């Protein structure tokens, strides 16, 4: 049957969204109204039955009762969605020459302690992975070096586990998490362990509805970065681990072909503190872009986890 | 504002995330997956919904599941009735709308109650605030006959607006005004128990937050919901609420129907009754069945549902 053409469901639309009511937050009721609309469109267009109704409110219990909505809001495509948009506005706003955006992810932990110039953030021993300097100047897009820009990372340690998320133990506060500010010439580097990719947790909801889909849960190995400064945007980005056999199938779609970066094996690594001589070096230079009248159109405010 | 739904990046996109052109799978739930999305994206697209206004989405499911309210939610927006709308539909097209009519389930179901036969005194705890309350009827087909051993299961609120099994000040005894009854060789049921008050959502919970920001109540009015089922007959879900609430027209969950607000009686004799005073009301409640079509039951619904031992 269909019946969403019809008066009786039209009307109990706009009660359900109160389009009718007393002054309020009209654009809260404008979204109501128009994801329940196309819900009740999707359900009579494709016969959605009762049963698979409720299995899909059974997920949303299981889902949020995981802390997962975010972690999905990336396997399903939501957030490189989410990217796209950002990317269109700046394409016809005529920018190019910035570092490309990609994927936040969930992960963010705030509060990281800053240094200046140089950070060590691998405080935890991971004997299965190796040393790893991570290193670049800051820019803007007119080629000048940023002095006192702000660049922070985190990344997963050899087993794919973030410090605060890692559920076989908790990790010290910070773990392969930092924020350095530049030097007078740009520079920033950080001296770390190398990131592998992992998966989605196997029993959680992200997983469940990946299983049901077909899909795998990984990512390939990487590093994600806020980087900021005055004058300038903030800049969401990453980089993978060149090699990964993951790296054009991440089940966050987040890959970039100019965030790649060629790692180098280098030599002399007791020198730098690192635990090993032998220690690979990737270099990352970030080009952010200037503000536009003072403002920041594309930061981003969502829930994020802290420590102290 | 910037469109980008329609080009091949976003169409590209969407088919990777529902896995269309994968290997062999749940064609269907890839189908339902893709519909979903590329919806969701199109409104994303034509609202201009930000990013700060899709993580507030993100946030509140993941309120909603911690909370455990999705399908309090279901009701609250109107898509418990909606697929009751679609049901009544599908009946008038098949000539199967002969029957009681249905309205909807609500979350609060517990399997495992105890069954009598023909009565049931269901109030296990006292109650000061609600006075006694006696629902019977008889169970017939569509063509009148009555349905001997056909199941009647009833359940509702305490005074408080509370159910046993959901009560946040205090358990109640398992199965507090929740009971079956096995009909009668004349199809006759009857339930004693004490008279139920309306109640609203959770006040701090996801789906209260949400009405909130829309600016509706949450609250619905007095009401007893019941499960009919026998042999060879379809499984009905029904409720009927108590006359004369105020709420009666403006429920949350928009489940209230003319034909199911039925009269309500005063009664003298309870205490012969087994009843706490000599005044208690009655409410005649009678159930007319669908016989199945062609052996099978097709609205019958499957969804999770709490348990409980006696
Ligand atoms: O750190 C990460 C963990 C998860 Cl689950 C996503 Cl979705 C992104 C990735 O960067
Ligand atoms: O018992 C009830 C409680 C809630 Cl939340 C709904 Cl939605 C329906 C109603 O029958
Ligand atoms: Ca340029
Ligand atoms: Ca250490
Ligand atoms: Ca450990
Ligand atoms: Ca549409
Ligand atoms: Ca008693
Ligand atoms: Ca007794
Ligand atoms: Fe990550
Ligand atoms: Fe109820």
Known sequence: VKVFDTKEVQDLLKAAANLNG???????????H????DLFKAIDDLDITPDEVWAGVNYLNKLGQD?????????????????????????????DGGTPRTIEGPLYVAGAPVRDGVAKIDLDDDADAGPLVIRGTVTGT???????????????????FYSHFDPTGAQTAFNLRGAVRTDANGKYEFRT??????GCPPQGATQQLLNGLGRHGNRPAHVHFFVSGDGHRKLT????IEGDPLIWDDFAYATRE?????????????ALGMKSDAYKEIEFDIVLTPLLDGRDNQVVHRPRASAD
């Open 34 to 37: 128009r994801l329940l609309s």
């Open 22 to 32: 007393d002054a309020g937050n009209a654009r809260f009721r404008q979204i109501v």
């Open 193 to 198: 362990l190398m990131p592998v990719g992992y």
């Open 258 to 270: 100019e965030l790649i970066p060629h790692v180098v094996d280098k030599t002399g690594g007791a």
């Open 67 to 95: 802390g997962e909505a975010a972690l999905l809001a990336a396997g399903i495509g939501l957030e490189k969605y989410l990217d796209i948009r950002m990317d269109a506005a700046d394409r016809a706003a005529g920018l």
């Open 142 to 160: 007119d080629g000048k070096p940023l002095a006192g820009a702000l660049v922070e990372c985190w990344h997963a340690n050899s087993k794919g």
């Open 237 to 240: 980005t990453q980089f993978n």
